[PDB]
Design a protein around this motif. Structure first.
Motif, PDB file in Angstrom:
ATOM      1  N   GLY A 108       4.681  16.640  37.239  1.00 37.20           N
ATOM      2  CA  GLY A 108       5.186  15.296  36.988  1.00 37.20           C
ATOM      3  C   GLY A 108       4.177  14.189  37.099  1.00 37.20           C
ATOM      4  N   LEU A 109       4.483  13.062  36.443  1.00 35.54           N
ATOM      5  CA  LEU A 109       3.703  11.847  36.448  1.00 35.54           C
ATOM      6  C   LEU A 109       4.554  10.656  36.861  1.00 35.54           C
ATOM      7  N   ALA A 110       4.108   9.841  37.833  1.00 37.30           N
ATOM      8  CA  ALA A 110       4.889   8.719  38.313  1.00 37.30           C
ATOM      9  C   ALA A 110       4.075   7.451  38.509  1.00 37.30           C
ATOM     10  N   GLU A 111       4.707   6.290  38.257  1.00 36.05           N
ATOM     11  CA  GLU A 111       4.076   4.986  38.254  1.00 36.05           C
ATOM     12  C   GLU A 111       4.475   4.202  39.481  1.00 36.05           C
ATOM     13  N   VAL A 112       3.544   3.476  40.133  1.00 37.06           N
ATOM     14  CA  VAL A 112       3.890   2.735  41.333  1.00 37.06           C
ATOM     15  C   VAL A 112       4.033   1.252  41.076  1.00 37.06           C
ATOM     16  N   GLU A 152      -0.055  11.784  39.846  1.00 39.20           N
ATOM     17  CA  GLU A 152       0.140  13.036  39.147  1.00 39.20           C
ATOM     18  C   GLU A 152       0.436  14.103  40.177  1.00 39.20           C
ATOM     19  N   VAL A 153       1.678  14.604  40.187  1.00 39.55           N
ATOM     20  CA  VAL A 153       2.069  15.721  41.009  1.00 39.55           C
ATOM     21  C   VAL A 153       1.944  16.985  40.188  1.00 39.55           C
ATOM     22  N   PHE A 154       1.420  18.056  40.797  1.00 39.23           N
ATOM     23  CA  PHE A 154       1.007  19.200  40.034  1.00 39.23           C
ATOM     24  C   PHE A 154       1.333  20.481  40.743  1.00 39.23           C
ATOM     25  N   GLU A 155       1.754  21.461  39.943  1.00 33.60           N
ATOM     26  CA  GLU A 155       2.100  22.778  40.379  1.00 33.60           C
ATOM     27  C   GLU A 155       0.867  23.677  40.369  1.00 33.60           C
ATOM     28  N   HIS A 172       7.060  19.317  48.123  1.00 31.99           N
ATOM     29  CA  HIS A 172       5.714  19.624  48.567  1.00 31.99           C
ATOM     30  C   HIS A 172       4.924  20.313  47.489  1.00 31.99           C
ATOM     31  N   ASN A 173       3.952  19.573  46.952  1.00 34.03           N
ATOM     32  CA  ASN A 173       3.037  19.989  45.932  1.00 34.03           C
ATOM     33  C   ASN A 173       1.835  19.095  46.123  1.00 34.03           C
ATOM     34  N   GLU A 221      -1.187  15.634  49.525  1.00 36.02           N
ATOM     35  CA  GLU A 221      -0.095  16.544  49.285  1.00 36.02           C
ATOM     36  C   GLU A 221       1.138  15.674  49.410  1.00 36.02           C
ATOM     37  N   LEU A 222       2.112  15.798  48.491  1.00 37.74           N
ATOM     38  CA  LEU A 222       3.302  14.970  48.488  1.00 37.74           C
ATOM     39  C   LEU A 222       4.072  15.007  49.811  1.00 37.74           C
ATOM     40  N   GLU A 223       4.108  13.856  50.509  1.00 40.30           N
ATOM     41  CA  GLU A 223       4.516  13.791  51.897  1.00 40.30           C
ATOM     42  C   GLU A 223       5.988  13.445  52.069  1.00 40.30           C
TER      43      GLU A 223
END
Length: 127
Positions: A33-37, A115-118, A62-63, A78-80
RNA sequence: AAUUGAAGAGUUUGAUCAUGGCUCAGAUUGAACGCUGGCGGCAGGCCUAACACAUGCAAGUCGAACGGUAACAGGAAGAAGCUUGCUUCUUUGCUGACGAGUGGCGGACGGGUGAGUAAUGUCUGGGAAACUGCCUGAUGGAGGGGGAUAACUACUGGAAACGGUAGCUAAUACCGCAUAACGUCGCAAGACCAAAGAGGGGGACCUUCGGGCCUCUUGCCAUCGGAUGUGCCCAGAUGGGAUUAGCUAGUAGGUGGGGUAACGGCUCACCUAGGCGACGAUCCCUAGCUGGUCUGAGAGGAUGACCAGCCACACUGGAACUGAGACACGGUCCAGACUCCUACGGGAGGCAGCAGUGGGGAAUAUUGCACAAUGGGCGCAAGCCUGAUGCAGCCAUGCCGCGUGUAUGAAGAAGGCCUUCGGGUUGUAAAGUACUUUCAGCGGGGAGGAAGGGAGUAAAGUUAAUACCUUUGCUCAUUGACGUUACCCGCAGAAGAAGCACCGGCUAACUCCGUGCCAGCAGCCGCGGUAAUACGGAGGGUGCAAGCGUUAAUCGGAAUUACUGGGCGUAAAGCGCACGCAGGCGGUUUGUUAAGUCAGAUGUGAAAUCCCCGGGCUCAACCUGGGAACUGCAUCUGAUACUGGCAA
RNA sequence: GCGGCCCCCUGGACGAAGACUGACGCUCAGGUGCGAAAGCGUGGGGAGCAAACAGGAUUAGAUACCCUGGUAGUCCACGCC
RNA sequence: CGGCCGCAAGGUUAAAACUCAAAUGAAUUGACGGGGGCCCGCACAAGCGGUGGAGCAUGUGGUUUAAUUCGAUGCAACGCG
RNA sequence: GUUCCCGGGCCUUGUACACACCGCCCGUCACACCAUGGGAGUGGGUUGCAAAAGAAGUAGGUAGCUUAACCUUCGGGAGGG
RNA sequence: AAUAUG
RNA sequence: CGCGGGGUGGAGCAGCCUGGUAGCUCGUCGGGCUCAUAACCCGAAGAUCGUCGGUUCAAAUCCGGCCCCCGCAACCA
RNA sequence: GAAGCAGCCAUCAUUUAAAGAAAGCGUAAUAGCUCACUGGUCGAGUCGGCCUGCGCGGAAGAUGUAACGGGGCUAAACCAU
RNA sequence: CCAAGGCGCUUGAGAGAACUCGGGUGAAGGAACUAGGCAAAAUGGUGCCGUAACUUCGGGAGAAGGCACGCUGAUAUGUAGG
RNA sequence: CACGAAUGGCGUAAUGAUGGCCAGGCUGUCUCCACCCGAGACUCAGUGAAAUUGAACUCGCUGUGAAGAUGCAGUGUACCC
RNA sequence: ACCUCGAUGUCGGCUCAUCACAUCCUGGGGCUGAAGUAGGUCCCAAGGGUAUGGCUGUUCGCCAUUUAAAGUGGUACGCGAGCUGGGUUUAGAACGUCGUGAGACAGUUCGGUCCCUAUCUGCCGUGGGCGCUGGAGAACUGAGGGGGGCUGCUCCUAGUACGAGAGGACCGGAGUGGACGCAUCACUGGUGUUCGGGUUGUCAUGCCAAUGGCACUGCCCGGUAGCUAAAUGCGGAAGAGAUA
């Protein structure tokens, strides 16, 4: 590991199988996934809280993440914490308001992108 | 003949004296590793998994206990082909025998191991209520009968191991009866219990001519004895721990019954309620012990393979039989673990015997030879068996002997090393010359371990028998596994044969070069940061020798657990102080006992072994005669100062 | 370990002369008793002082020394250690 | 650690592994003490004149540079060799 | 003038100091390493106590079954297995 | 007064 | 569009009815003390009074704005 | 077993009717077997797009045809008249 | 389980099916079911022997876990005791 | 996230129709349910309710529809009880 | 926010299904970077088949060990006038947190009623009336409709094809199991309270003897017939026709 044996070919296969199990396992890195702040908040849990809107793909608890602006990684992690609306939740999908903050993150710039990534294992086999 | 036996050093400090630990020089070993190694003598050589095992061998033996021919070796008869008088082939126990089998004895010994086992064991000294194969001395019998049965035959089940059904047949096997004290049981009278023959030869009588019968040898049986062997019982001594203090129901005792070869809670029934315990019970941990070995001046300590005595064990666990003796290392049964073979149904095994192998571990050996000798088993002997034993192989493991040359030899050679570059040293060493040839190498010779036994003769003894056999002499054949024995003689030619540690102080023995607080040395205190007597290397030197050194191991030194032979005011060490039971010790006088103690005597204290004096192996080590030691203990007889007991 | 005064109960050592008993002694592991200060149990008491603890000084720091307050405790009964 | 005692705090009985070569006693000489006595020097006291601020001279450190020759740095170096 | 400061001399006293207080020297914490105590527990060996189990063998008892020696009345008894 | 470390 | 009080040098500070050369602490850079260092001591660097108009000889001292911090309101993804 | 087509480079020209140092199968690699290019033969229409009319495919769902109302229709459709 | 005494429950009579209700039993396995051993089952008495960690020392405790147990005869023409 | 020392902390034997977990025993709880014996359910005779109810000659499917149709449309299927 | 608040009872489980095909497995094929083989992928194909356990509120998921293979979905997230009530919207209580508090939490823990006799339709079985053209009895034709439709493992073909070797077939044959269904009691078993025996306590039959009653069939051991599955027989086809 105790084996008294049958044929030498199966022995030459089982040493290869042992080496294959021995072998280091992973190679693939691919986006989830991709996310905007937008709109930072401050919190004693993590320092800062970056309000987010996931622009593309799926976000999971968690990724690894890459916080980037224009081809530089601004911050790494790492996604907290994955929060939606007011509650922490397991997963979030594109087109949805989110919040995220990471321990010792105080570094928010609006319009930065997460950018969250597997990461996916492959298990190489000797031949 | 027998008491000649004891050492210290280094190291705490700026320096000293104490205390006090640590460390070293010693001796020793069933040794390993490292490096190096010529020959010989003697001794010794799995201390790890009581872990498991391939293949071979480790006790059988008597035909003179007996059926027998399964042997196979002769002989004979006979039947036959002839070689024509002999070969051949069927019978035959006639005969030298002898498998399987029957019976007897041996298999309970020796050999191997140290798991369990702290005393039930062991050692020493005593004892009473006992048995004891074979083997000897003594006194007497050895009579008369009977029934089976394996083997073997005829059938039959099995892959194999291993059998099944039915008859037949002998015995020093088995079973009755007679016979029986001095024996067992009884007060006695009495009752009752044994037998077996076999072998050699021979006149007489005779024989169903098989032998009867005689005589000799041997075996059988009962009993009183011997010596031996074993069981039994008691005392004392014989590992460690109190952070093991309570322990015992057949437990402790009695009576009676039963049981063993025999005493016995040995085991029952019954009765009583005790027993053990600070002199260490019980429990746990740990271990085969002693004569001895090793160390130690001695006293002591450590240690118990070798060697011998004793005990205990024999794949794990338990029981009994047989037999004189086993609760049986190569017997049996059963149970268990585990291993193997197989035709798969069902069967087989216990190398801690000798060799030998896997595994283990640092690490401990040849799948040898022989009954020639000693000692055994059986037998009358021959004889046979003997992995006991005698020998050999392997290993520098230990002990011990010997060699690896001797004499001459200065120009004190060159080289090496040092060198104030004057020389010094290595070094009479080498080189050279003159000699010798041990032990090796090679070729020749040759003790002792062999006395006996066998066979033949003679005497003497024996007998009815010049017999016949044994004994005791004689004589002749012989009897060596090791073994190419020990040992001796002849030849060539210095030829074939020296390494290892260490050198700062301890501790005998010194410089130079390299490296440079690096790399490394170190047992101890310690050395090295460019001039290292302490590292690496060389030269030199010292010690020791076919070994050397290191390591591990034990005692020593260590009077550093102190009996001999220690300390405790302040160095480690006097309970905070007191009363007190058990325990230790006890004023002074007399009598007595004689336990302790002291004396004497006898017995015993295995031998090997240590010691002292000798002998013999080419000499020593090693072997071996005799003595001493046998350090103790018990019993008995004495002494009466001292201590104890008892009496005042 | 015990220092005001007095009493009651009550321990021991020593002397003096004289008398009597006649070794009755000495030491003692195990066992038993006593045994400051601190501390604990229960109930009282608490003037000083004083852990704790507070504050003010000092100091680089001072939760110490120094200084001002001040609780348990210090006191008593009966127990315990 | 186990046993025993104790309400608990704690006491008592009481190790081994391991590590290191000294731990340590008394005494002697010296040095040192924010220990003491005694005692001296422009040591302090009592005084006078200066340095340390200014500008300049020279040396040093440091900086810089192709080179800023080299050594000397508590008293006991810095107008030093 | 010698109270104070620096430096120095004598005596006397104290000392864990002797590259002599510019000496020496304590313990946490951080770090690495080594052994050891506790430890929910886990896994073995040994073993007390209390029961079950009961092969084989012995010992004890046997109205059965079966049977050569002895006894006999010849039927069987006795005896054995 | 008061004064730490090599 | 929300209530309180503050803004002076690098950081933190005094100037309140008393508008009259901006000085004082903590850091920073120098000097002294010591054998040397901490410690200690003497010093130097350091400014539109947040920012603006007025106030006005001179200004948190006297006003209103802009702005910032803290006060609580103060969300709290 | 490479001489165009397993590789790497040159990324061109010759001989030439016509043939690109050649596009593929094929060959062990050429050849074989063709393309590109042209000759002979035969015989007239041939080749690629564009704009519009109407179709085809793209088109898989939940109780039973189940997206002409149904039968059923190629006119009983569609378009124009 | 019976005596004295009192009762047979105020709809009956037939079938003998699903399924539900109240019960008995079961091969082989023994919680696999299920939110969950719920429910059923199994234990169950006396006497004697024997009985842990741990503990405020009383407990734990009936811990746990075992053995004996009928009837008839004898001891005793029915003993000890009352 | 976001204990806590009387809105008590932490230990705690005995105790509990307590909560969670596990072990053994035991079983039709279950894999996987069968059979039988009792009482209803059924037939007959007698007696005899109750909730409910716009009216009904009260079929399926697809679609439509105040959006999930016994009644509508289309179609299929259906002797009466 | 259109139906439903003068009631459509909310998650999961159990029992019970049914359909769709975007097919998990079995079928038939193309292409394959398809040697064999094991695969990969796509199309066509919906007849039948399509795991037990450990964990938990549990869907899902994780994990186990299996299997031809453990499909994805629709159906009021199928199914409460069939069942369960653990989760989940009742009243108790507590903890944390928040609120001065009463209290709250979309944080949690322990506890805590699932009602209804089926009229109609529907659905599964079995009857009566009438019709079918004089009446009656029998046997059929089969218009029409339903059930059934699974798959492992071994051997041969063949240790061949194919392949360097290892490995290891197609296709076509022959057995023998699981799963599941129908049938059925000879067998092995089960039950068997109407058949027999043993046994405890007590009452009655005059009494002793022998029986009987009662106590869960008193307790308990056996067991005929019938009925039964865990017992044992069988089944799923081949082939044809028209096609994707």
């Amino acid at each position: 590991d105790l084996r008294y044996y049958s044929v030498i070919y199966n022995l030459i296969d089982e040493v290869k199988a042992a080496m294959s199990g021995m072998l280091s396992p992973e190679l693939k890195q691919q986006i989830i996934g991709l996310a905007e702040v937008r709109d930072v908040f401050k919190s004693p849990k993590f320092g800062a809280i970056a309000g987010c809107m996931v622009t593309e793909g799926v976000v999971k608890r968690h990724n690894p993440i890459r916080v980037l602006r224009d081809n530089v990684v601004i911050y790494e992690g790492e996604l907290e914490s994955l929060r939606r609306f007011k509650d922490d939740v397991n997963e979030v999908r594109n087109g949805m308001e989110c919040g995220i903050g990471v321990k010792n993150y105080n570094d928010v710039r609006t319009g930065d992108v997460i950018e969250v990534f597997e990461i996916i294992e492959i298990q190489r086999t000797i031949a």
